[PDB]
Design a protein around this ligand. Structure first.
Ligand code: FE
Length: 816
């Protein structure tokens, strides 16, 4: 008989009841097959007893002994079936035979709920052509089980992965004001697909999916946590459904001032705190995750944590130096572009928006003594250009009550000292014969004194409102969360758990479908958190669809992105093949190090399973996986010529490298600085509510006499500020059970020592890189861009981190 050990976690975690005839397992042979070519299956074997021997276990886990009637004639077991006869589900961790290891990490529901018996494979890795013959059909049948048939309402215990469009955000049955365009499946609104839920149509609209208390994700995608405080993804739901209403009542009852009246009222939030009604505090204080967001006296006070950006200087955010520095080392460091001609041009139709010629004059700019031609030629001119991106939406946004924006463009000059300085801001508005508004476009230049300094500060706020919107919806939501989901779905639908590429990529998908489903429900839904806290309101998500029209997979590679944006040039004589035009560009310089480490890892892994390009072309699973990811997952862009073909080792490496980059380092860089930089609403306003005032009006006089109030009346109001600070605080927090780049949730994910050795080298390289990044932050010559006047060391690309709001650490995946 074969001695075995089963490790599982009872539901209450995320014992004698498991004995008796509660759980049975059946070994399956990988070498001996029946008359049909399928591995022979053993007898039902039940758990015999609780093993309390090994000191190693922890995590609310329990081990059970079991002995299998299996002689050499049945061959070597390569898989097993398991049936749970208990009413309640349990989390199966692993099976070990004494060595043959099985890494399961899967919920096993009552046997009657399953159409086919749950099957698990040993930790060996096989491309299809290498699958032991007795396991071939089992392998394909499990993939067919995972794909489902594209119909039906998905249930909690289902493990069916499929695609659908974003037609579940509107709530037309509640109000036609909550109706939203379907995103995806049309040329008007192209969009990445998301996980199919199948709840069916709304009563009023056959094209929109009805509401649901729970937005399904394949069962094992819904991460349980040993500590409730680690279930960060449930925070947005509680925030939108419970906390927001409580905050709103405090305002409706006039228990707290409706608006901030000075910058100190904002600073007060993380100092003495804000006093709220007792019942409001009582509503918030007992909630999991939410209670970790604020310190309280348990009675009337809520205190937010001090954001990193003000920890050394609370006023530094208002410096021109910090405004420009955050474009290369801030929460959204990947939009700035080189400017090689002047004035900047627009590709928008003047027949629609009016003359689009820039009004910025070269002679008005202070380029530290450089002429415009000199600045252009020396590659010292850059820009943060939101003119063409926002112009198409300015009219409709400005028609909203309490929303007014400009399509902005900021010109930056790279000083000889290596820091960026802002030299002009153009605030553009569309013009069309017949416009009722008399407001016009204008250029604002830097100023430190007088009303001119206030107008320049407001111009920076309009720019950052554009940036915050683009950051949240595009850099963050579209480019990481939404763009990655199709790849997660395709991977489970077409790459067997035995597949080397499945093993290479899946750690980088942890919690992504889960947070996305929770986002469709409470973050990007009609009247959800984003719509109620950011400038575009009901136009927010569709704006991301317009941007997706220009999304290019291969341009997500870091070198390609830097080159496309004109912030680096190709240069083979450099370590990374590219020369940065802003040498001390923190995000890019640190990013290239991480990018290189991932590349080395993928390049070492792939060859272990694919010897030649032909081996990649002939992998049926791999080919079906890619064809589906492109043609269905990102199907609205299937007509684009830039998609890799995946017929060579090079292409496979490229595709995997880009996927891992987006899921780990790119997402970390644009996510974990959310509260550290945006926790002070003045530094990262999410909305603007009025345009610049006309001379001779009280609003203009206010800019002169009360600049802080002029600023506060312009940016996000206090109520939505409380809600948005809470959400970005959640998003910037690392759960204590996070799995970071260079780590895996199990040391036995594969039995291949070669793959394991390569992974160990990858982790060692990341530790090596962290020491280098530490040296960069400690280098006094780099203080200007790596720390700035806010004296905040750029640690967002440090690979490792402890739990919490740390401003560092690269998780493997888009996990929050
Ligand atoms: Fe995120």
């Amino acid at each position: 008989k074969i001695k075995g050990t089963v490790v599982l976690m009872p539901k209450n975690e995320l014992l004698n009841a498991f004995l008796g005839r509660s759980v049975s397992l059946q070994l399956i042979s990988a070498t001996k097959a029946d008359a049909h070519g399928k591995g022979k299956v053993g007898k039902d074997t039940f758990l015999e007893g609780i093993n309390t021997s090994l000191p190693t276990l922890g995590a609310g886990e329990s081990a059970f002994n079991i002995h299998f009637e299996w002689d050499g004639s049945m061959g070597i077991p390569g898989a097993f079936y398991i049936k749970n006869y208990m009413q309640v589900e349990f989390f199966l961790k692993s099976l070990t035979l004494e060595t043959i290891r099985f890494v399961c990490n899967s919920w096993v529901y009552n046997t009657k709920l399953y159409k086919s018996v749950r099957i698990f494979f040993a930790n060996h890795t096989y491309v299809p052509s290498e699958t032991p013959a007795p396991l071939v059909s089992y392998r394909e049948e499990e993939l067919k089980s995972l794909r489902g048939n594209g119909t039906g309402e998905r249930k909690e215990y289902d493990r069916i992965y499929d695609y659908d469009v974003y037609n579940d955000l509107g709530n037309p049955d509640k109000s036609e004001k909550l109706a939203r365009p379907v995103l995806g499946g049309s040329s008007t609104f192209p969009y990445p697909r998301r996980g199919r839920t199948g709840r069916g149509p709304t009563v009023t609209d056959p094209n929109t999916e009805k509401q649901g208390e729970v937005f399904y994700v394949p069962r094992d995608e819904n991460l349980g946590h040993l500590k409730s405080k680690d279930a960060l993804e449930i925070g947005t739901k509680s925030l939108s459904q419970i906390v927001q209403p409580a905050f709103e009542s405090a305002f409706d009852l006039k228990s707290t001032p409706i608006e901030f009246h000075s910058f100190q009222d904002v600073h007060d939030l993380y100092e003495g705190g804000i006093k709220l009604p007792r019942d409001v505090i009582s509503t918030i204080i007992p909630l999991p995750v939410i209670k970790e967001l604020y310190r309280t006296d348990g009675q009337h006070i809520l205190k937010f944590p001090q954001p990193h950006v003000v920890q050394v200087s609370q006023s530094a955010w208002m410096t021109d130096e910090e405004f420009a520095r955050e474009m290369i080392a801030g929460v959204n460091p990947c939009v700035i572009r080189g400017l090689e001609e002047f004035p900047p041009k627009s590709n928008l139709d003047p027949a629609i928006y009016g003359d689009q010629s820039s009004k910025i004059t070269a002679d008005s700019l202070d380029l530290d003594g450089y002429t415009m031609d000199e600045a252009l030629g020396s590659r010292r001119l850059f820009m943060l250009d939101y003119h063409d991106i926002f112009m198409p939406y300015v009219r409709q946004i400005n028609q909203l009550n309490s929303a007014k924006t400009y399509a902005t463009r900021t010109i930056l000059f790279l000083r000889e000292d290596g820091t960026l300085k802002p030299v002009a801001i153009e605030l553009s508005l569309p013009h069309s014969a017949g416009d009722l508004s008399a407001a016009v476009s204008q250029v604002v230049l830097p100023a430190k004194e007088g009303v001119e300094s206030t107008i320049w500060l407001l111009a920076k706020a309009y720019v950052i409102v554009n940036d915050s919107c683009y950051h949240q919806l595009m850099s963050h939501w579209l480019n990481t969360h939404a763009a990655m989901e199709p790849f997660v779905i395709a991977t489970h639908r077409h790459l067997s758990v035995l597949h080397p590429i499945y093993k290479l990529l899946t750690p980088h998908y942890r919690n992504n479908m889960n947070i996305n489903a929770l986002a469709r429900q409470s973050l990007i839904n009609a009247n959800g958190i984003i719509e109620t806290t950011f400038l575009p309101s009901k136009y927010s998500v569709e704006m991301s669809s317009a941007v997706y029209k220009n999304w290019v997979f291969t341009d997500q590679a870091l070198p390609a992105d830097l080159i496309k944006r004109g912030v680096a040039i190709k240069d083979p004589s450099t370590p990374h093949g590219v020369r940065l035009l802003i040498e001390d560009y923190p995000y890019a310089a640190d990013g290239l190090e991480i990018w290189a480490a991932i590349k080395t890892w993928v390049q070492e892994y792939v060859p272990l399973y694919y010897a030649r390009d032909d081996d990649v072309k002939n992998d049926s699973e791999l080919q079906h996986w890619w064809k589906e990811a492109v043609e269905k997952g990102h199907g609205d862009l299937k007509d684009k010529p830039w998609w890799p073909k995946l017929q060579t080792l090079e292409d496979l490496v490229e595709v995997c490298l880009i996927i891992i980059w987006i899921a780990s380092a790119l997402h970390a860089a644009v996510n974990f600085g959310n509260y550290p930089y945006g926790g002070l609403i003045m530094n990262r306003p999410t909305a603007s509510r009025r345009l610049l005032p006309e001379k001779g009006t009280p609003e203009y006089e206010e800019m002169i006499n009360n600049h802080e109030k002029a600023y506060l009346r312009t940016i996000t109001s206090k109520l939505p500020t409380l809600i948005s600070l809470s959400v970005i605080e959640i998003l910037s927090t690392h759960a204590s059970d996070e799995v970071y780049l260079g780590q895996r949730d199990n040391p036995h994910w594969t039995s291949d020592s070669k793959a394991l050795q390569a992974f160990q080298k990858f982790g060692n390289k990341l530790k090596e890189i962290e020491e280098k990044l530490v040296r960069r932050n400690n280098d006094p010559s780099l203080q200007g861009n790596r720390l700035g006047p806010v004296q905040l060391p750029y640690t967002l690309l440090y690979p490792s981190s402890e739990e919490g709001l740390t401003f560092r650490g690269i998780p493997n995946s888009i996990s929050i």
